Amino acid sequence: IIIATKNGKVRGMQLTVFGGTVTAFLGIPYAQPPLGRLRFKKPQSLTKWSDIWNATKYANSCCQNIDQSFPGFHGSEMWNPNTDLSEDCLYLNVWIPAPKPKNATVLIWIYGGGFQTGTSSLHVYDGKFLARVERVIVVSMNYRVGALGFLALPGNPEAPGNMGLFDQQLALQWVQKNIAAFGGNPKSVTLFGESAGAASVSLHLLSPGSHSLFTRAILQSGSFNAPWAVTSLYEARNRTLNLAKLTGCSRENETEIIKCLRNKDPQEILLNEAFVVPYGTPLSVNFGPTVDGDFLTDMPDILLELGQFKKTQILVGVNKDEGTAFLVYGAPGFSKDNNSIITRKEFQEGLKIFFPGVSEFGKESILFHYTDWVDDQRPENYREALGDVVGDYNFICPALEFTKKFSEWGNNAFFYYFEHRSSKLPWPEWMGVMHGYEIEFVFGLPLERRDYTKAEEILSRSIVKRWANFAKYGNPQETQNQSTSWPVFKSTEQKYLTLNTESTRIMTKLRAQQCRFWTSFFPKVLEMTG
Amino acid sequence: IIIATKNGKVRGMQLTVFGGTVTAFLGIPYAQPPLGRLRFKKPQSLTKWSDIWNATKYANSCCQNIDQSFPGFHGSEMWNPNTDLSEDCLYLNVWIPAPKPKNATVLIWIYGGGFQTGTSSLHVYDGKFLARVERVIVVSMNYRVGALGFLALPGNPEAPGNMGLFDQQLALQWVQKNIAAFGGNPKSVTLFGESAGAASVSLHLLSPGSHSLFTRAILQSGSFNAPWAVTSLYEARNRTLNLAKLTGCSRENETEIIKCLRNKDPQEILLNEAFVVPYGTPLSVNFGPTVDGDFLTDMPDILLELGQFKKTQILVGVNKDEGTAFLVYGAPGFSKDNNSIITRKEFQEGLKIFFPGVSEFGKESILFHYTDWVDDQRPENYREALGDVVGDYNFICPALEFTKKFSEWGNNAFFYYFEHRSSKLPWPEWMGVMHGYEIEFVFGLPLERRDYTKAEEILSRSIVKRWANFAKYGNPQETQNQSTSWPVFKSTEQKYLTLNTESTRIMTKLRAQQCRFWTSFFPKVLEMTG
Amino acid sequence: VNFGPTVDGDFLTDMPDILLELGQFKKTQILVGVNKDEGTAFLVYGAPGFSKDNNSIITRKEFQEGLKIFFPGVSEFGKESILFHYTDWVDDQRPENYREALGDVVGDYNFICPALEFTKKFSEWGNNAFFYYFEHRSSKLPWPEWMGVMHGYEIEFVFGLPLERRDYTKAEEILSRSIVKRWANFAKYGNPQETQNQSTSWPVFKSTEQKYLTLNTESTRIMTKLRAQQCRFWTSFFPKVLEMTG
Ligand SMILES: *[C@@H]1O[C@H](CO)[C@@H](O[C@@H]2O[C@H](CO)[C@@H](O)[C@H](O)[C@H]2NC(C)=O)[C@H](O)[C@H]1NC(C)=O
Ligand SMILES: *[C@@H]1O[C@H](CO)[C@@H](O[C@@H]2O[C@H](CO)[C@@H](O)[C@H](O)[C@H]2NC(C)=O)[C@H](O)[C@H]1NC(C)=O
Ligand SMILES: *[C@@H]1O[C@H](CO)[C@@H](O)[C@H](O)[C@H]1NC(C)=O
Ligand SMILES: *[C@@H]1O[C@H](CO)[C@@H](O)[C@H](O)[C@H]1NC(C)=O
Ligand SMILES: *[C@@H]1O[C@H](CO)[C@@H](O)[C@H](O)[C@H]1NC(C)=O
Ligand SMILES: *[C@@H]1O[C@H](CO)[C@@H](O)[C@H](O)[C@H]1NC(C)=O
Ligand SMILES: *[C@@H]1O[C@H](CO)[C@@H](O)[C@H](O)[C@H]1NC(C)=O
Ligand SMILES: *[C@@H]1O[C@H](CO)[C@@H](O)[C@H](O)[C@H]1NC(C)=O
């Protein structure tokens, strides 16, 4: 089937889904391929073409180091890119319900991967199920990542930082100009992303540029105010230089460092990236977003406090076990291959892995708030506690704190705490309800009968409906199959719905005790040293 | 007199009314005659004409089976079409006050007849009285009905469903483009309809298409949420196919079934219509509205709950005896020709007629809530109770429930309970204040002195004034002839005005006990079986 | 309860449900609460397939056999509705399904829902009311694991028996201590907080919101609308099926 866009005609394909039809346009270019001179620059606009683009393959993932800790292990490879890596990677997918609606609501997916990795083309981001089941147009884009997407040399026009964010933004502009031709409704666009894809979404709530480019926003396990999310102006300078040194790019004429790196291979850049930071963590974001003065026009960490953002409804949530995923990538005593029971000495071995540049009081205080058990019996004591440290600290408390500061200014916020564990989950039980493992449900994967427990097909169906109802109508309610209605998260009561296969309840003040610590006591201990 | 419309000049006539003058344009085409290829398709736009249309006859009623249960009986023939049946029937009438106003408020009539029947041209829908008495422009249209108006083959472009609704919609667009030429005010249009004409109006409150095509809405004895009102996507599929089989239209190439039926006679279609459903009821709506994804963009039954509809004032009401009308068309023991006293065995004989696909608990529960009398004396016990079952269930509870869920979202809702019985009524006393017998009063029929009790001339004059004041000003008050003012129906108190010839009172919570049953206990009993 | 309280005209002057409906009761504070598994204790004393000596993993038919036991004079359709509400299995998996179904049927109907209804009707007249959900299995419990947090077995803790450093785990001695402090505080001060050992404060059960406090060795949350679905069934729907029954 053919569709006429502002750049030229495009040819898509017709997938068979649930005894009916969806129409897919995979890998549509939306920007000029950021090659050679353009590398590091903001995405340039795209020249028209008088033929037809064959939007029938998935396109290239952007350049990134691939995870190699567990080769052949699905648990980690289901996250690895499944298309040729290439600097020529600025493409987007569109999935339309059949028959062409009408004036359809648009869902836009922004993938995560701590700004270092990710790709639109993953199987768990397959938009076909959503389009067909809920008659929505789903859209996802590739945007640059790592130094190629986030190299900052402050103010300097040929290395401004936030390139990857601009990529998302331009893709959003594409949908604003072109989606009507597809039957979609530019005045209803919900942005949705996960982890660093959620920090991204949250940043678009701040970005004067993005402001008129979407209606609403969904924020799965991530927000700009999370500790990993935003690079300071001068951490970024330091990093860009350290790279220059690691590759033989040191100079004086500052533009030349950028002429220097423009001429290296993606690979001389890639291998060195991991080494530009003094001491790492498994969550180290070497090239993420910076306050660039163009995209972000001022520290986000302030715009929030003073109410400067798009005022609209938001859906935000986290997972029961955000922190476990990380423990197998640095923390002594941990292996995906046994019950990972750990010793107190090892817990502290662990604390230095996750908080390397922190005081002795910092750690001993973390230690104290997390390790006074009612019955110091359960051999899993420490193992569970290192996970909650990593979780609460980097994901839960930031997310809840974001939802507070934002809903403070009059808008509707709904919050979820997702806590069912996939029957299919390739990691072991101790790891629980890991980071990034609700995406399957959101994208409606357990809907595909030929796979999942029947319970999970109910659970995906709910989340799917709830999501679409939020996109369409600004309300993540599921009205038919007798549910319990989802209360709006206000600053006093602080209500959030729990998601699982066997009892959704309304609960208040998630992580009360633990966010206090992370939100006031701990940062105070940090003021004392550094 | 001549008027220039966007399609061409039109010639109307001048009726003599109440010692003054009204100007009438009967049977104006507003769509392309849905013939041959167009049958089943949405109404096509209409080519200009350079002569003059002679809008001086009533036009054709659309094809429908006529009621033949009581030939010669006025009570049923006053409802039967009074113009040649024809597939060429998309016409509208306009009645203008003389002399040509000005910037007049517009009332639009949508006739009922459980989507199977009806016609604009009935004597009880004569708009001349209203136009003259209240200086309003009245407008009514013919729209397709039965399978010809509501054949659904989901998404399939040449049999989309809701054709008859689109007919109404296009007629509404006509008024938006043309009414100013007549002296009417497109920024004040009240929609008003009865029964299935009220379900229609309620559907236009949901329909993105209709949204900017009227100001306000009046809903007499009907709403989409009534049990008869809306066909499920797959009841509709099943029905369309069963028809195909009943006529020798079975196929595989699905479009061909539609090419097949396109080539049959209205009559091979008509006689079979009654037979496409497994078991009937006297209220069976074989081809009604469906969730089509184009007109209705999602289950209405949800759009309501989530507040997605035109936010405006509404007038809604029912009649003291909505249910009696139906009892003479299936229910054992019932005849318009004696006091129809019935036995308990027969009451249950009756319950299976009106609830055929329901459990044994379903019926025995209905039985229980309706048949515990204070004094099981009155021989009319069961007779009255089968009427209220049919009434409360299909008309009263749905209507009240609609008024709740809608007014929940901030708009003004007024509710009436009309309860005077026409002195002229051709059916017998036991039947009481039947379904569809307030229309006479609304259209101002007892105003025509030469006929009705003087009391009824007062009663019509009130309702007439109240209606116009709602259309013009959004307030169904009657300020002069010392009335009692009509309170707004809010969700707490739930006030409604009673209409009759000898005491209008403000009362609360109509049918409290009975709607509880129909609204929670009963549907719960239904969850247990099916 | 073959020989119990009646309206004698002397101790109870009128029907208790009336007195409660119309607010004829001593206006004061109360502390109410129930145990996670009230019902189970009674399934060993009559219900087919139940023993304190095994798995007790029962089949559908012994579920219905069991219903006949606990609802002797309840209509054909009456029982069937209790069946539908509690056997709503998303996945037909757990071999332990109907076992817990029956547990809950007996608990919700005889203990939890009447307790909850009680607190509402009482709070409605504007006295403080405190509701708890005791959800901790004593390690000492002689009864089998499946019987859970049984009827009667919160008393050990209220009377301070886990305080005896000679027996109970150390956590049970913490939980017992709090409960003991909460209990004494309430009695002294009409307010069952544990203000020291940094508790989570225990809010009033207001007629609207329906807050309650969970009591355990572990996750001590404040929660809302306990057994909300189950008690709608027992509160309004089931009493409307009894009105047909006879
Ligand atoms: C699970 O596996 C891990 C990793 O294989 C075991 O952790 C190891 O502990 C010993 C001494 O600390 C060393 O042989 C390894 O170097 C450790 N792993 C690393 C690299 O940190 C752990 O003991 C196992 N746990 C069990 C059996 O529960
Ligand atoms: C009123 O008339 C009706 C219909 O003519 C009478 O109902 C009939 O009852 C007997 C036995 O049930 C039969 O002769 C008919 O078949 C019935 N009608 C039908 C078709 O259902 C009814 O008895 C009369 N009632 C009175 C005298 O009050
Ligand atoms: C894509 O393939 C189609 C086959 O139908 C063909 O028309 C065309 O050559 C291809 N498009 C391009 C970009 O050449
Ligand atoms: C889609 O809906 C919006 C309002 O949400 C409206 O303004 C727009 O015109 C509609 N577009 C089409 C083509 O239906
Ligand atoms: C609700 O109804 C049934 C389960 O009874 C299920 O098949 C259907 O998908 C549900 N709908 C939603 C949107 O959850
Ligand atoms: C309608 O009748 C009038 C008589 O005044 C005449 O002018 C005309 O021929 C007729 N119109 C049409 C459609 O021919
Ligand atoms: C009629 O009234 C409306 C306001 O209700 C106004 O905007 C419009 O211009 C008026 N039209 C004429 C022709 O008087
Ligand atoms: C009120 O006044 C008289 C009855 O006294 C009647 O003729 C007139 O029509 C009434 N007006 C209305 C609008 O009811």
Side-chain angles (χ1 to χ4, degrees):
Chain A
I1 256 177
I2 273 79
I3 294 291
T5 90
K6 276 189 131 179
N7 297 65
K9 307 187 137 187
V10 295
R11 184 196 319 279
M13 70 221 217
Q14 259 167 18
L15 331 177
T16 294
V17 192
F18 301 140
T21 287
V22 174
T23 311
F25 297 67
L26 318 174
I28 297 178
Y30 73 76
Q32 226 210 121
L35 286 154
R37 47 199 292 158
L38 300 184
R39 165 192 285 172
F40 291 133
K41 277 195 208 170
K42 295 169 69 176
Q44 301 323 323
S45 79
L46 190 57
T47 310
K48 28 276 161 219
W49 59 80
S50 3
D51 43 23
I52 307 157
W53 195 274
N54 269 10
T56 50
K57 269 181 163 73
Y58 273 144
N60 304 325
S61 313
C62 301
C63 298
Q64 46 202 279
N65 317 278
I66 288 72
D67 175 18
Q68 273 155 35
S69 328
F70 314 96
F73 181 54
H74 188 66
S76 50
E77 270 171 5
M78 67 171 282
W79 296 112
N80 278 140
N82 61 347
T83 301
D84 220 21
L85 302 204
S86 168
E87 273 196 292
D88 181 338
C89 61
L90 303 190
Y91 296 90
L92 54 83
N93 324 303
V94 189
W95 286 271
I96 313 139
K100 249 93 225 286
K102 100 97 190 316
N103 192 19
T105 261
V106 182
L107 268 137
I108 291 170
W109 184 246
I110 296 162
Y111 65 70
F115 299 99
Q116 304 318 297
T117 53
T119 199
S120 72
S121 69
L122 293 200
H123 163 58
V124 274
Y125 310 145
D126 211 333
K128 71 194 186 177
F129 299 101
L130 279 169
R132 162 79 163 146
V133 165
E134 286 286 346
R135 300 210 74 244
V136 276
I137 287 180
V138 184
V139 170
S140 67
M141 89 288 297
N142 280 352
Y143 59 90
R144 276 167 277 164
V145 290
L148 282 102
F150 297 98
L151 189 81
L153 219 44
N156 197 305
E158 41 279 343
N162 302 327
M163 289 81 79
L165 291 171
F166 278 110
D167 290 337
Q168 303 172 6
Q169 187 154 304
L170 196 55
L172 303 201
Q173 298 178 211
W174 186 95
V175 155
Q176 284 298 279
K177 304 209 230 293
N178 294 298
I179 219 45
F182 287 81
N185 178 176
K187 286 191 289 317
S188 182
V189 178
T190 286
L191 291 186
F192 79 137
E194 180 276 341
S195 210
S200 279
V201 173
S202 77
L203 288 167
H204 290 283
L205 291 175
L206 303 208
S207 184
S210 296
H211 165 92
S212 80
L213 304 185
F214 67 109
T215 318
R216 279 186 265 298
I218 311 170
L219 276 52
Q220 305 174 225
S221 314
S223 43
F224 62 70
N225 73 311
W228 47 273
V230 180
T231 319
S232 87
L233 267 155
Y234 288 90
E235 295 164 313
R237 183 91 168 298
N238 190 17
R239 282 165 207 202
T240 301
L241 302 181
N242 298 357
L243 193 79
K245 309 214 200 311
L246 265 146
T247 66
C249 266
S250 268
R251 242 66 166 190
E252 37 160 313
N253 194 10
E254 216 203 53
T255 312
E256 266 198 336
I257 327 171
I258 309 313
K259 302 167 174 190
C260 186
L261 289 161
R262 253 212 310 116
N263 258 271
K264 250 149 213 160
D265 272 305
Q267 264 287 183
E268 235 233 289
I269 287 153
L270 271 171
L271 316 149
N272 290 119
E273 263 180 33
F275 290 120
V276 298
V277 146
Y279 309 123
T281 47
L283 268 153
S284 210
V285 192
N286 295 339
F287 294 103
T290 42
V291 187
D292 77 321
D294 171 2
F295 189 100
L296 279 153
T297 62
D298 190 16
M299 292 199 33
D301 314 272
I302 295 161
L303 296 163
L304 192 61
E305 211 53 69
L306 300 175
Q308 314 285 131
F309 46 75
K310 191 169 171 78
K311 302 281 186 308
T312 188
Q313 311 77 55
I314 61 166
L315 214 160
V316 194
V318 293
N319 295 356
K320 203 238 263 311
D321 290 286
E322 296 281 0
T324 56
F326 297 93
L327 294 171
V328 296
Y329 287 88
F334 290 93
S335 182
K336 56 169 210 82
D337 295 307
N338 57 39
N339 62 15
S340 262
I341 288 312
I342 54 146
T343 68
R344 188 177 164 98
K345 329 142 210 179
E346 276 172 307
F347 175 102
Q348 320 178 18
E349 273 193 279
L351 282 187
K352 265 176 213 53
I353 303 308
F354 284 99
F355 301 100
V358 168
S359 60
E360 328 69 38
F361 202 30
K363 303 189 276 279
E364 230 156 84
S365 70
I366 295 160
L367 210 182
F368 179 81
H369 193 78
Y370 273 110
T371 54
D372 90 308
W373 348 90
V374 266
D375 237 10
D376 40 313
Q377 307 326 301
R378 304 148 53 265
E380 64 270 22
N381 278 327
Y382 291 102
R383 188 196 73 193
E384 297 206 10
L386 193 56
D388 293 309
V389 161
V390 169
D392 298 341
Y393 177 62
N394 282 95
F395 296 105
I396 301 172
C397 304
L400 292 155
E401 192 62 32
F402 179 82
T403 322
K404 290 177 187 135
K405 312 246 77 170
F406 169 107
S407 81
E408 276 194 58
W409 296 79
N411 301 86
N412 275 347
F414 305 77
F415 193 84
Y416 67 84
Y417 183 59
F418 169 102
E419 62 181 29
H420 167 76
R421 170 186 217 262
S422 196
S423 53
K424 291 176 73 159
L425 214 277
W427 310 84
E429 281 203 338
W430 74 260
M431 293 199 50
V433 200
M434 317 192 6
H435 180 75
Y437 279 102
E438 82 301 334
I439 314 175
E440 340 196 307
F441 286 76
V442 183
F443 280 85
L445 271 64
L447 299 176
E448 174 63 85
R449 55 157 132 263
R450 285 210 295 96
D451 265 343
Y452 286 111
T453 89
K454 282 186 166 177
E456 288 163 343
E457 179 173 45
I458 307 319
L459 190 45
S460 185
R461 195 58 198 100
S462 263
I463 293 175
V464 165
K465 158 71 73 217
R466 283 190 184 281
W467 260 228
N469 269 7
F470 181 88
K472 292 162 170 229
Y473 314 119
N475 217 18
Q477 305 307 340
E478 188 280 307
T479 71
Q480 288 181 293
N481 285 39
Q482 305 231 21
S483 72
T484 36
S485 87
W486 190 341
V488 187
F489 182 91
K490 303 172 209 164
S491 235
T492 37
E493 335 139 70
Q494 286 157 359
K495 294 185 209 203
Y496 65 93
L497 170 83
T498 62
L499 311 177
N500 53 67
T501 50
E502 27 65 344
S503 61
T504 59
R505 297 239 181 205
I506 315 304
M507 309 212 39
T508 67
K509 322 186 171 226
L510 178 70
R511 300 300 157 150
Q513 336 149 66
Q514 303 86 167
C515 296
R516 210 160 328 178
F517 172 80
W518 289 119
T519 220
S520 60
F521 184 65
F522 179 76
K524 270 187 235 283
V525 182
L526 284 207
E527 287 174 53
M528 272 157 59
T529 7
Chain B
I1 256 177
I2 273 79
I3 294 291
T5 90
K6 276 189 131 179
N7 297 65
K9 307 187 137 187
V10 295
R11 184 196 319 279
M13 70 221 217
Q14 259 167 18
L15 331 177
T16 294
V17 192
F18 301 140
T21 287
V22 174
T23 311
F25 297 67
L26 318 174
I28 297 178
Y30 73 76
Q32 226 210 121
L35 286 154
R37 47 199 292 158
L38 300 184
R39 165 192 285 172
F40 291 133
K41 277 195 208 170
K42 295 169 69 176
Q44 301 323 323
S45 79
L46 190 57
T47 310
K48 28 276 161 219
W49 59 80
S50 3
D51 43 23
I52 307 157
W53 195 274
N54 269 10
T56 50
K57 269 181 163 73
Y58 273 144
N60 304 325
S61 313
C62 301
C63 298
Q64 46 202 279
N65 317 278
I66 288 72
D67 175 18
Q68 273 155 35
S69 328
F70 314 96
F73 181 54
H74 188 66
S76 50
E77 270 171 5
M78 67 171 282
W79 296 112
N80 278 140
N82 61 347
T83 301
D84 220 21
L85 302 204
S86 168
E87 273 196 292
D88 181 338
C89 61
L90 303 190
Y91 296 90
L92 54 83
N93 324 303
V94 189
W95 286 271
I96 313 139
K100 249 93 225 286
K102 100 97 190 316
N103 192 19
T105 261
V106 182
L107 268 137
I108 291 170
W109 184 246
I110 296 162
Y111 65 70
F115 299 99
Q116 304 318 297
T117 53
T119 199
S120 72
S121 69
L122 293 200
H123 163 58
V124 274
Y125 310 145
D126 211 333
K128 71 194 186 177
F129 299 101
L130 279 169
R132 162 79 163 146
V133 165
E134 286 286 346
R135 300 210 74 244
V136 276
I137 287 180
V138 184
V139 170
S140 67
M141 89 288 297
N142 280 352
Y143 59 90
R144 276 167 277 164
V145 290
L148 282 102
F150 297 98
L151 189 81
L153 219 44
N156 197 305
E158 41 279 343
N162 302 327
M163 289 81 79
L165 291 171
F166 278 110
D167 290 337
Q168 303 172 6
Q169 187 154 304
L170 196 55
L172 303 201
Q173 298 178 211
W174 186 95
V175 155
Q176 284 298 279
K177 304 209 230 293
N178 294 298
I179 219 45
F182 287 81
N185 178 176
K187 286 191 289 317
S188 182
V189 178
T190 286
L191 291 186
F192 79 137
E194 180 276 341
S195 210
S200 279
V201 173
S202 77
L203 288 167
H204 290 283
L205 291 175
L206 303 208
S207 184
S210 296
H211 165 92
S212 80
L213 304 185
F214 67 109
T215 318
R216 279 186 265 298
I218 311 170
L219 276 52
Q220 305 174 225
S221 314
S223 43
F224 62 70
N225 73 311
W228 47 273
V230 180
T231 319
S232 87
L233 267 155
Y234 288 90
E235 295 164 313
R237 183 91 168 298
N238 190 17
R239 282 165 207 202
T240 301
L241 302 181
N242 298 357
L243 193 79
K245 309 214 200 311
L246 265 146
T247 66
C249 266
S250 268
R251 242 66 166 190
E252 37 160 313
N253 194 10
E254 216 203 53
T255 312
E256 266 198 336
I257 327 171
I258 309 313
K259 302 167 174 190
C260 186
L261 289 161
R262 253 212 310 116
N263 258 271
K264 250 149 213 160
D265 272 305
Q267 264 287 183
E268 235 233 289
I269 287 153
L270 271 171
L271 316 149
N272 290 119
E273 263 180 33
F275 290 120
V276 298
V277 146
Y279 309 123
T281 47
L283 268 153
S284 210
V285 192
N286 295 339
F287 294 103
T290 42
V291 187
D292 77 321
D294 171 2
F295 189 100
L296 279 153
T297 62
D298 190 16
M299 292 199 33
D301 314 272
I302 295 161
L303 296 163
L304 192 61
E305 211 53 69
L306 300 175
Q308 314 285 131
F309 46 75
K310 191 169 171 78
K311 302 281 186 308
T312 188
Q313 311 77 55
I314 61 166
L315 214 160
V316 194
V318 293
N319 295 356
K320 203 238 263 311
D321 290 286
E322 296 281 0
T324 56
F326 297 93
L327 294 171
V328 296
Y329 287 88
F334 290 93
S335 182
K336 56 169 210 82
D337 295 307
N338 57 39
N339 62 15
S340 262
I341 288 312
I342 54 146
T343 68
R344 188 177 164 98
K345 329 142 210 179
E346 276 172 307
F347 175 102
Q348 320 178 18
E349 273 193 279
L351 282 187
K352 265 176 213 53
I353 303 308
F354 284 99
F355 301 100
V358 168
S359 60
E360 328 69 38
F361 202 30
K363 303 189 276 279
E364 230 156 84
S365 70
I366 295 160
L367 210 182
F368 179 81
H369 193 78
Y370 273 110
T371 54
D372 90 308
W373 348 90
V374 266
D375 237 10
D376 40 313
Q377 307 326 301
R378 304 148 53 265
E380 64 270 22
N381 278 327
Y382 291 102
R383 188 196 73 193
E384 297 206 10
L386 193 56
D388 293 309
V389 161
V390 169
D392 298 341
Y393 177 62
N394 282 95
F395 296 105
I396 301 172
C397 304
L400 292 155
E401 192 62 32
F402 179 82
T403 322
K404 290 177 187 135
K405 312 246 77 170
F406 169 107
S407 81
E408 276 194 58
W409 296 78
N411 301 86
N412 275 347
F414 305 77
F415 193 84
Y416 67 84
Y417 183 59
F418 169 102
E419 62 181 29
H420 167 76
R421 170 186 217 262
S422 196
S423 53
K424 291 176 73 159
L425 214 277
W427 310 84
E429 281 203 338
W430 74 260
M431 293 199 50
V433 200
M434 317 192 6
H435 180 75
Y437 279 102
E438 82 301 334
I439 314 175
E440 340 196 307
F441 286 76
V442 183
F443 280 85
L445 271 64
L447 299 176
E448 174 63 85
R449 55 157 132 263
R450 285 210 295 96
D451 265 343
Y452 286 111
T453 89
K454 282 186 166 177
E456 288 163 343
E457 179 173 45
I458 307 319
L459 190 45
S460 185
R461 195 58 198 100
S462 263
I463 293 175
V464 165
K465 158 71 73 217
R466 283 190 184 281
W467 260 228
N469 269 7
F470 181 88
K472 292 162 170 229
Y473 314 119
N475 217 18
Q477 305 307 340
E478 188 280 307
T479 71
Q480 288 181 293
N481 285 39
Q482 305 231 21
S483 72
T484 36
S485 87
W486 190 341
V488 187
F489 182 91
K490 303 172 209 164
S491 235
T492 37
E493 335 139 70
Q494 286 157 359
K495 294 185 209 203
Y496 65 93
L497 170 83
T498 62
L499 311 177
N500 53 67
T501 50
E502 27 65 344
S503 61
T504 59
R505 297 239 181 205
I506 315 304
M507 309 212 39
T508 67
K509 322 186 171 226
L510 178 70
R511 300 300 157 150
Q513 336 149 66
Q514 303 86 167
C515 296
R516 210 160 328 178
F517 172 80
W518 289 119
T519 220
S520 60
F521 184 65
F522 179 76
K524 270 187 235 283
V525 182
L526 284 207
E527 287 174 53
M528 272 157 59
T529 7
Chain C
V1 184
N2 270 1
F3 275 103
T6 54
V7 185
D8 59 298
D10 180 2
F11 178 95
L12 269 212
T13 54
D14 212 336
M15 270 204 44
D17 272 49
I18 303 166
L19 308 157
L20 189 71
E21 203 48 43
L22 302 188
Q24 302 314 91
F25 47 76
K26 182 184 180 80
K27 312 278 200 284
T28 197
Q29 313 80 47
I30 57 183
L31 201 161
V32 193
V34 300
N35 299 357
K36 188 195 233 299
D37 292 297
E38 309 277 4
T40 54
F42 303 89
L43 311 159
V44 284
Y45 293 85
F50 286 90
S51 176
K52 73 139 176 72
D53 288 324
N54 63 23
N55 61 322
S56 249
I57 298 305
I58 50 149
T59 59
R60 175 153 177 111
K61 306 209 181 183
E62 288 160 302
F63 183 82
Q64 297 141 17
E65 279 188 70
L67 289 189
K68 291 154 191 164
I69 294 295
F70 285 91
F71 298 96
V74 166
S75 76
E76 184 77 315
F77 266 120
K79 312 190 214 277
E80 299 172 52
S81 36
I82 301 160
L83 215 168
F84 182 98
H85 193 103
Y86 282 91
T87 59
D88 50 4
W89 315 134
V90 213
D91 238 325
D92 305 27
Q93 307 321 310
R94 316 148 56 198
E96 78 251 359
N97 251 348
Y98 286 94
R99 189 194 69 201
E100 289 175 51
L102 195 50
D104 295 312
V105 171
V106 176
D108 303 352
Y109 173 68
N110 294 88
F111 302 106
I112 311 203
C113 298
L116 286 160
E117 211 56 41
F118 178 80
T119 319
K120 304 186 197 176
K121 307 267 97 208
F122 182 100
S123 92
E124 269 163 44
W125 304 74
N127 327 70
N128 289 349
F130 299 102
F131 198 85
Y132 73 70
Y133 186 58
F134 179 89
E135 59 179 25
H136 167 85
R137 159 155 270 229
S138 187
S139 52
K140 297 204 69 142
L141 258 268
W143 304 97
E145 202 68 44
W146 72 259
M147 296 191 67
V149 200
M150 282 181 56
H151 184 79
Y153 286 94
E154 92 295 343
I155 307 165
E156 307 187 329
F157 298 73
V158 171
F159 273 94
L161 277 69
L163 297 179
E164 179 52 90
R165 49 149 139 254
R166 290 151 146 180
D167 262 306
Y168 297 112
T169 88
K170 198 142 213 204
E172 299 190 303
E173 198 212 51
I174 282 104
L175 170 61
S176 179
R177 182 83 190 84
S178 321
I179 292 190
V180 160
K181 182 65 70 201
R182 287 193 182 288
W183 258 244
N185 275 320
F186 175 85
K188 286 166 195 158
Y189 312 131
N191 197 0
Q193 309 308 316
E194 196 306 275
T195 62
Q196 266 207 313
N197 270 275
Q198 299 157 319
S199 81
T200 59
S201 96
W202 189 355
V204 170
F205 189 97
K206 283 171 194 159
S207 195
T208 342
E209 340 127 308
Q210 275 145 14
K211 293 171 200 214
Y212 69 90
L213 183 76
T214 75
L215 290 174
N216 47 24
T217 38
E218 316 130 48
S219 173
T220 172
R221 285 266 160 172
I222 293 171
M223 294 204 74
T224 34
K225 300 179 169 170
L226 176 77
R227 293 295 216 286
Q229 291 90 146
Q230 289 72 246
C231 293
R232 293 195 298 265
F233 172 82
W234 293 113
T235 290
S236 52
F237 188 94
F238 185 76
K240 278 170 218 161
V241 184
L242 302 179
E243 286 163 16
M244 308 172 196
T245 284

